[PDB]
Amino acid sequence: AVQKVVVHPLVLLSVVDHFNRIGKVGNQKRVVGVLLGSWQKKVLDVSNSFAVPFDEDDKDDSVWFLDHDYLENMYGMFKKVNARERIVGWYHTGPKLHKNDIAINELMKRYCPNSVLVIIDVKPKDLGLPTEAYISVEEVHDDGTPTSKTFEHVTSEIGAEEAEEVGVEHLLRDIKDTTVGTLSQRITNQVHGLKGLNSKLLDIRSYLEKVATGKLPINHQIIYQLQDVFNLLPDVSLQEFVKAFYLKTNDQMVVVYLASLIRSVVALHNLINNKIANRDAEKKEG
């Protein structure tokens, strides 16, 4: 159905507000809010949202608390002031996916249309993309397991419409734009290695552990395709790619010629002025 979605920073900043108004409780469990957007267009667009109280139980995990009246009131007034946005789905700040979440989402699965689930972290220590869009659909399982709600990963992007970019850029005055050049590119070319390093290290360890040491048949079948992807590159000897390396290095030579020639052109005015201005200043000095 939906190929990709658009998530604005405003809702995550509303989560920052959720971490703001806490006021030192001593509980700070997962808080379920109500996300709003436009389900009319194929691509999902998030504008703004509100917050609803959500509480659970220590021992029993099947306990979930929502409000129909508050939801209908907030959505009612929001629809009253703005008719260009309606209900879509919900989201939680919990780093882990609870089993009760299917029952929590079941409500909006009944009353509302199909809802999208978003998982974020309470502490922004994650370098990767904090927002993961998960569509709720029923898929046929190959192993023959009974049909249940399955969360499928949907690609997403973080962007703003018009004024939000200005607001962010003004409030920050730190981050820099694309700015094609040396430092902007080389920073990426440096840190990206760590971007892959910490992620892969955080992944393959728990992967290796849970595969051999673990149970609850999450359908490992896709991981054979994972390993297959890892085997899609059987150590190519580059012998066929030698010509490509030759063309690339030829382009490098072109870069060399361009650089040398252009710099040689720039050196003109400098290696003229450095003489003609100095000799004239010196002779007219006294």
Partner: peptide, 16 residues
């Protein structure tokens, strides 16, 4: 949070 989110906004998911 906002810095990481904006940097990620100017970056990719897996970044590679």
């Amino acid at each position: 949070m906002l810095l990481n989110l904006h940097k990620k906004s100017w970056m990719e998911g897996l970044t590679l």
